[PDB]
Ligand binder design. Structure first.
Ligand code: HEC
Ligand code: HEC
Ligand code: HEC
Ligand code: HEC
Ligand code: HEC
Ligand code: HEC
Ligand code: HEC
Ligand code: HEC
Ligand code: HEC
Ligand code: HEC
Ligand SMILES: [Ca+2]
Ligand SMILES: [Ca+2]
Ligand SMILES: [Ca+2]
Ligand SMILES: [Ca+2]
Ligand SMILES: [Ca+2]
Length: 627
């Protein structure tokens, strides 16, 4: 027995006896009644003090009426709560909106059926009818973009409405701690201007992901009638959460404000909304002004790839590159071979900055058709490593010079790209060519795609933007397949040009794409992801292992490469051999056909000898499934 989803509805609220009687109906993912819940509770009963009631400019706030774990299982999927101690403070007002926060703890029914956590709020008028007014600003779904759905976020609960129901203005006032009001706390813990908690945690990582972008949590919605409160209700209590150096009482860093009466008179919604979103809006506008369309052909006699880049405008119309060359900050072309098992390594790949700060490299030209044209100089070794090695794949990244939301001419040929306020990474592209002239091989893209990355990093993520790279914006420009609904898949297959089976610049960094995303995110995003493979994966492509060879897993004492068989290499990124995270010894892994941190030749020869998937049957839902 296992329930996948527990749905909760408050179906009836009756005040016929004084204190409300509250009926909850519980169903599973199949809409069948759930009988026997043992940990159902009204975690909070509240009523809504309306906006301005506590003073001009002040927020609406949730006033406490108690809680209850007292209920009858009616044996039909419904549960009826009573309150032993309703409204201890004697503030109940039937003219106010009434809220109930209902939670069901993860656990087991009696029959042993597993039941997942469930939370909800529902609002009512003072007689249990539909409510007359609400404070509906955000919904739990925005938090699930970045925090694993169904797991506690910091503590107590899994859904933002539960946090909001306890972290009230009344709660903060009662503790003498303004900062624990949820509308203060939530900005505080994602903003690095001040630390939080006894430990003085500086939110460096939250700051680097969220970047004060109001629109990752504040989203307009017919379902959320107070969604525009983020710009319409300026208060010292909320604005000070990130604006930490103003003292409104003393008039330091701002004119004196003794209350919230005048904030909106000067801080109009249009200005607050515009000023906090201006820069991301302007950047997104610049990224969407141009595209590129890239082709690649192999000379059958020289075995060199020629890559052609067509700039296009927002409508897909040709732009001659000569017209915008002075504004191009960088354009880079990286070519590798064998899209399912890259063969040239990091050191052997072909790479060029065809354009730097408005100057063509002498190896790149613009033809009479207005296309940039570049021919590889490295030995591509086409056809030297089986059918996959027939195919060259070329990744194009580029950037435009930009200031205050406009493209500008490059004024400084030596501009180093460190100052990311001076340029915009643009839409990257991927082009395939074959030596044989047959259709190209392509890597699988059916297990991970850029939609998952964009949940935390946004669709405008300028990957590697800085001193070393233009910034790769990943879009349908480099899609070559569709999912089962016909949606273009934006794969990470182009990243393999550098993230090769031989690693990146050093044999020490687990640079292969099969290892690198796991290594970065298990080290730096475990608070968000932990073991949640679904944060990136729709599926595992286990069949892809049959196209892999050796994967670089370590550097020897002399700085040369050590390699593992590909399943062992992939699992060991998070399961280090000889650590507390890996039960299998090296000897045991070798008994299962593996090479652990051996020579490229030994790992290549053994790459299809691993018996791991005889026992292991990983799925995204449970990657641990085995024996
Ligand atoms: C991605 C853009 C995010 C969205 C949307 C939300 N949160 Fe977040 N949060 C995020 C990061 C990158 C971090 C820092 C993690 C780290 O490792 O340092 C956080 C941090 C928090 C915290 C602090 C405690 C913690 O879990 O580390 C809280 C309490 C928190 N976040 C809550 C939260 C809620 C309730 C959200 C929806 C309104 C929410 N976050 C959105 C990234 C993102
Ligand atoms: C009451 C039933 C709570 C619910 C639901 C949530 N939290 Fe909470 N939180 C609670 C208490 C009693 C405290 C200590 C307050 C104090 O006096 O210091 C907290 C504290 C936090 C903090 C630390 C805030 C700070 O020190 O600046 C965070 C980041 C926090 N709580 C987050 C949080 C989130 C995201 C919740 C919903 C998932 C949540 N809390 C619910 C009580 C209650
Ligand atoms: C998620 C990590 C958020 C980001 C980023 C920002 N805000 Fe936010 N805000 C968030 C929550 C969960 C809440 C509480 C909502 C509730 O129902 O209590 C808020 C609240 C505000 C408010 C208060 C509105 C009111 O009625 O008093 C304001 C003025 C506000 N938020 C503004 C704001 C701005 C300007 C941001 C970008 C700079 C922004 N928020 C980011 C969650 C998150
Ligand atoms: C963190 C999530 C923030 C909250 C909450 C609020 N603001 Fe903010 N504000 C923030 C940043 C990162 C910036 C710089 C933005 C940029 O692109 O330049 C700002 C800026 C302002 C400004 C302009 C700067 C100035 O010196 O006055 C104003 C007037 C401003 N912010 C007002 C404001 C108000 C009224 C808020 C509560 C509704 C508020 N901010 C919240 C980050 C955050
Ligand atoms: C008009 C007479 C104002 C009243 C009343 C309030 N504020 Fe203000 N504020 C005003 C100006 C002209 C500026 C500078 C704008 C700029 O872009 O330079 C501000 C600034 C702020 C900021 C930003 C602080 C910073 O980034 O340095 C915040 C967060 C802010 N103001 C909030 C705020 C609140 C909450 C008010 C009522 C208590 C309030 N301001 C009153 C103009 C006026
Ligand atoms: C939220 C749950 C995330 C998902 C999904 C993905 N990434 Fe991520 N990434 C996340 C965090 C919290 C951090 C560390 C930030 C810090 O400041 O330390 C990262 C880091 C990266 C980096 C490093 C560069 C950077 O901008 O910090 C890269 C290049 C990166 N992440 C890429 C990436 C890709 C391609 C993803 C889809 C496979 C991806 N991330 C998912 C949080 C999250
Ligand atoms: C060669 C021009 C590269 C391309 C194309 C991509 N990456 Fe990269 N990446 C590269 C180097 C030299 C390094 C540092 C050494 C190392 O292997 O760690 C990286 C690093 C990453 C990281 C780790 C964190 C960081 O340093 O930013 C991640 C998560 C990463 N790279 C992801 C990534 C993705 C998703 C790419 C396709 C969009 C991608 N890289 C392309 C070199 C190059
Ligand atoms: C985003 C930060 C990721 C998380 C979280 C996890 N995986 Fe992953 N995985 C990721 C990428 C970018 C790739 C490379 C795809 C490529 O083209 O090489 C992978 C690859 C795997 C593979 C190889 C098979 C495949 O589908 O490509 C396996 C078996 C795999 N990942 C397993 C896995 C497990 C078990 C996770 C949860 C603990 C997990 N991944 C998280 C990115 C991310
Ligand atoms: C990082 C992105 C991971 C990759 C890649 C893989 N695993 Fe994993 N695994 C990971 C975590 C964070 C955990 C939970 C650890 C804890 O105790 O909380 C696990 C757990 C397992 C387990 C269960 C633990 C045990 O002692 O056996 C198994 C069997 C397991 N993982 C197997 C496994 C295999 C076969 C992988 C390659 C296909 C693999 N994991 C990759 C994180 C990550
Ligand atoms: C059956 C005889 C097995 C073969 C063949 C392989 N593994 Fe295994 N593995 C097995 C069991 C019974 C367990 C523990 C399961 C549990 O829940 O406790 C494991 C565990 C792992 C783990 C998790 C390690 C940890 O977290 O400590 C990993 C990463 C793992 N196994 C990988 C792995 C690889 C790469 C194999 C082929 C070389 C392999 N296993 C073979 C059972 C069996
Ligand atoms: Ca209802
Ligand atoms: Ca819910
Ligand atoms: Ca802070
Ligand atoms: Ca293309
Ligand atoms: Ca075999």
């Amino acid at each position: 027995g296992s329930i996948q989803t527990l749905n909760l509805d408050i179906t009836k609220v009756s005040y016929e006896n004084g204190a409300p009687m509250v009926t909850v109906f519980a169903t599973n993912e199949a809409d069948m009644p759930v009988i026997g819940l043992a940990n159902l509770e009204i975690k909070k009963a509240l009523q809504l003090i309306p906006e301005g009631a506590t003073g001009p400019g002040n927020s609406a706030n949730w006033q406490g009426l108690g809680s209850s774990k007292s209920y009858v299982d009616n044996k039909n999927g419904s549960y009826t709560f009573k309150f032993d101690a309703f409204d201890s403070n004697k503030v109940f007002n039937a003219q106010l909106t009434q809220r109930f926060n209902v939670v069901s703890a993860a656990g087991k029914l009696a029959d042993g059926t597993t039941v997942p956590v469930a939370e909800m709020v529902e609002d009512f008028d003072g007689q249990g009818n539909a409510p007359q007014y609400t404070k509906n600003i955000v919904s739990h779904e925005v938090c699930a973009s970045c925090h694993v759905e169904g797991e506690k976020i910091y503590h107590q609960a899994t859904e933002v409405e539960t946090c909001i129901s306890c972290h009230t203005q009344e709660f903060a006032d009662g503790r003498g701690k303004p900062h624990v009001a949820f509308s203060h706390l939530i900005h505080n813990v994602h903003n690095a201007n001040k630390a939080w908690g006894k430990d003085n945690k500086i939110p460096t990582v939250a700051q680097n992901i969220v970047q004060d972008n109001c629109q990752v949590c504040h989203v307009e919605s017919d379902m959320l009638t107070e969604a525009k409160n983020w710009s319409r209700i300026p208060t010292m209590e909320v604005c000070s959460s990130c604006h930490v150096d103003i003292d409104f009482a003393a008039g330091k860093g701002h004119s004196q404000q003794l209350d919230n009466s005048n904030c909106i008179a000067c801080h109009n919604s249009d200005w607050t909304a515009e000023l906090h979103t201006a820069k991301t809006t302007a950047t997104k506008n610049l990224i969407n002004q141009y595209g590129i369309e890239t082709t690649s052909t192999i000379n059958t006699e020289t075995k060199a790839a020629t890559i052609s880049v067509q700039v296009v405008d927002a409508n897909g119309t040709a732009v001659d590159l000569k017209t915008i060359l002075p504004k191009v900050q960088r354009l880079e072309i990286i070519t590798n071979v064998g899209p399912n098992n890259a063969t040239l390594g990091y050191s052997g790949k072909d790479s060029i900055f065809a354009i730097k700060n408005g100057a063509l490299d002498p190896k790149a030209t613009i033809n009479d058709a207005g296309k940039l044209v570049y021919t590889t100089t490295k030995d591509l070794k086409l056809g030297q490593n089986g059918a996959d090695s027939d195919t060259a794949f070329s990744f194009v990244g580029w950037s435009m010079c930009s200031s205050e939301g406009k493209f500008v001419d490059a004024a400084d040929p030596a501009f180093d790209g460190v100052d990311v306020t001076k340029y915009t990474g643009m839409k990257a592209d991927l082009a395939f060519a074959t030596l044989s002239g047959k259709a190209p091989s392509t890597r699988h893209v059916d297990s991970v795609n850029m939609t998952a990355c964009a949940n935390c990093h946004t669709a405008e993520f300028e990957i590697h933007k800085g001193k070393q790279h233009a910034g790769f914006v990943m879009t349908e420009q480099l899609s070559h397949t569709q999912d089962a609904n016909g949606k273009a898949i934006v794969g990470l297959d182009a990243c393999v040009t550098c993230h090769t089976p031989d690693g990146t610049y050093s044999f020490a960094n687990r640079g292969a794409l099969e290892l690198k995303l796991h290594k970065k995110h298990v080290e730096d995003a475990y608070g968000l992801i932990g073991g949640n493979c679904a944060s990136c994966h729709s599926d595992f492509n286990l069949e892809s292992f049959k196209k892999k060879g050796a994967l670089n897993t370590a550097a020897a004492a002399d700085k040369t490469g050590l390699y593992s068989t590909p399943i062992t290499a992939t699992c060991t990124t998070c399961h280090t051999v000889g650590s507390q995270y890996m039960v299998h010894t090296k000897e045991t892994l070798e008994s299962f056909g593996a090479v652990v941190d051996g020579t490229k030749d030994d790992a290549t020869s053994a790459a299809q000898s691993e018996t791991c998937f005889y026992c292991h049957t990983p799925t995204v839902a449970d990657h641990t499934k085995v024996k």
